[PDB]
Amino acid sequence: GSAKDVKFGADARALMLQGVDLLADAVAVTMGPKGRTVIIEQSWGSPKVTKDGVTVAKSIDLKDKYKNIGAKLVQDVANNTNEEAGDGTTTATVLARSIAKEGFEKISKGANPVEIRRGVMLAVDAVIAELKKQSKPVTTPEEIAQVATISANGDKEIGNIISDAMKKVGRKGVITVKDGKTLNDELEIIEGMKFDRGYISPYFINTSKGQKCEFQDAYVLLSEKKISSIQSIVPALEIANAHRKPLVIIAEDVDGEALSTLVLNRLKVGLQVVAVKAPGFGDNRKNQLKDMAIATGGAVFGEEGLTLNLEDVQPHDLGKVGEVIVTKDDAMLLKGKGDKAQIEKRIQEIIEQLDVTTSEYEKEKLNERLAKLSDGVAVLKVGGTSDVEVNEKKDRVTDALNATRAAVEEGIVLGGGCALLRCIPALDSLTPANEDQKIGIEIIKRTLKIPAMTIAKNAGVEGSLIVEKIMQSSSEVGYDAMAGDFVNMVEKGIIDPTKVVRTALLDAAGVASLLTTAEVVVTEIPK
């Protein structure tokens, strides 16, 4: 209903291209090992310093609405590349700018831009097939460290710590990046089963040094219900006292009367016992209690289906652990004595539940729970001096984690834009259906040299000469922009994940070739 302004043809296309060019010019200065950073003003507090392409793209919106349409479309390109790959957003931005520019240049009266877009998509399918032919799988941890080093802007300590994390918790294990309070990066490996619920009352401490509850070879009592009565807690304590064995009660809550009994027996006679709340929220509580029961070889009490009561407790429905550590804010069970076969069947149940979930929230819960059963999790604390430096480093650590996961998934290709340069002869063998598809294939052929050219231009050299020498060279040779030398790139560890490259190219090509079919732009009149 609002009044609109309608622009036609080449003027509207040039305004949208101005928006695309401004955003991609801001993004392109961050590409490669000699890329620079972008400072983005925040409404609150300190500005943000970043080398991340989608972060730069998302922070830019233009007053002119025709320019802002092109800026929003390349924002979509960078966001989609970040969503499905976690890396390569700058490459996708510069590819999208190249395709938009070449498509806008090739529009005349006789051109059919929809068929040009068909030719563009056919060329991208050919390039993706050639990239999959060129890809090789990751086999060594050295390749892992090289991928993580390249994706972290040449930082070898980040690559080494990510490779160590994947050596310790597995290549598909749970790795989590968070803030460090020190100057240096730290890797913490959380083994066993550790959850973020501490002890319930501050009267179960037997070790002064950490103000912590310390037991070894202890019974574990699992409860899906709150333990508030005498009759629901006394027989388990009788079993624990008749065996001279410590007891760890993991329940929904132990409050009031059972808590009073526990603290009275702990303080007066010296009964070894501790009470921890049940981690989780809702069905995750029941799932994690069940998993602790399989891992310790115990049984969950007070449940919906089997309905085991806390009055008839046996010595065989209490789990056994080799060590338990309880602190103020967390607890951890170590060396659970559960049946190993039941642990493997529960793990397979977790994997088959992963295979049918797609909400990306309970998927992370299932990954957490699988990691707790199998090998533990890894936490990378990112060190630094200030919050701005820590955040800038965490962007690259997240990029390197995502790229390493991608390289474990789909393999590796040559870095430095060389993998798209070696796909040009695949395009040279295509037979286009008509002239418009030939135009589209040639657009993609010219666009394939753009990442290597941008990396070389950011290094202060003539990018066209670098790309020409790479093309004239043997297939293993490419430009090391950091060293400024033509090297064997696999031997020097300058490699990229295949999935990142194909994702960036496909995401750029679809949106940019849709944009180049436009003839009329309708905007709202700014009030």
Ligand X SMILES: Nc1ncnc2c1ncn2[C@@H]1O[C@H](COP(=O)(O)OP(=O)(O)OP(=O)(O)O)[C@@H](O)[C@H]1O
CA dist 2 and 269 (Å) reads 80
Query: Which residue matches tokens 């990751």?
Result: 138
CA dist 476 and 485 (Å) reads 13
Which residue of 455, 470, 509, 515 would you call a contact of ligand X, by CB under 6 A?
455
- The number of residues that bind ligand X (CB under 6 A) is 27
**Please, which of residues 148-207 interact with ligand X by CB under 6 A?**
150, 154
- Interface with K ion, residue 30, by CB under 5 A: yes
Contact by Cβ (8 Å): 337, 219: no
* Binding site partner of 53, from a copy of itself, K ion, Mg ion, none, Cβ cut-off 5-8 A by kind: K ion
Query: Which residue matches tokens 């790795």?
Result: 175
The token pair that represents 264 in the structure block: 């009275």
Contact by Cβ (8 Å): 90, 450: no
CA dist 439 and 113 (Å) reads 9
- Interface with ligand X, residue 463, by CB under 6 A: no
Map residue 11 onto helix, strand or coil: helix
CB of 480 to Mg ion, least distance (A): 16
- The number of residues that bind Mg ion (CB under 5 A) is 2
Query: Does the annotation flag 89 for ligand binding?
Result: yes
Per-residue x/- track, 358-397, Mg ion (CB under 5 A)? ----------------------------------------
Distances (CA, A) of 470 to 55, 189, 406: 31, 43, 26
- Interface with ligand X, residue 35, by CB under 6 A: yes
CB of 4 to ligand X, least distance (A): 19
* CB closer to K ion, 90 vs 513: 90
How would you label 87-104 residue by residue, b for 16+ Cβ within 10 Å and e otherwise? bbbbbbbbbbbbbbbbbb
Query: Which residue matches tokens 């003539």?
Result: 462
List of residues 6+ apart from 456 with CB closer than 8 A: 32, 462, 463, 466, 467, 479, 481
Query: Which residue matches tokens 């943000």?
Result: 48
* CB closer to ligand X, 233 vs 456: 456
Please report how many Cα atoms fall inside a 13 Å half-sphere around the Cα of residue 80, on the Cβ side. 20
Q: Which stretch binds K ion (CB under 5 A): 45-53, 215-223, 449-457, 469-477?
A: 45-53
Q: Which stretch binds ligand X (CB under 6 A): 58-66, 204-212, 413-421, 466-474?
A: 413-421
The token pair that represents 123 in the structure block: 């060329």
Q: Which stretch binds ligand X (CB under 6 A): 40-48, 122-130, 208-216, 477-485?
A: 477-485
Map residue 200 onto helix, strand or coil: coil
Per-residue x/- track, 61-90, K ion (CB under 5 A)? -----------------------------x
* Binding site partner of 384, from ligand X, K ion, a copy of itself, none, Cβ cut-off 5-8 A by kind: a copy of itself
CB of 480 to ligand X, least distance (A): 4
Per-residue x/- track, 68-97, Mg ion (CB under 5 A)? -------------------x----------
Which residue of 68, 75, 80, 91 would you call a contact of ligand X, by CB under 6 A?
91
Binding residues for ATP: 51, 87-91, 416, 496
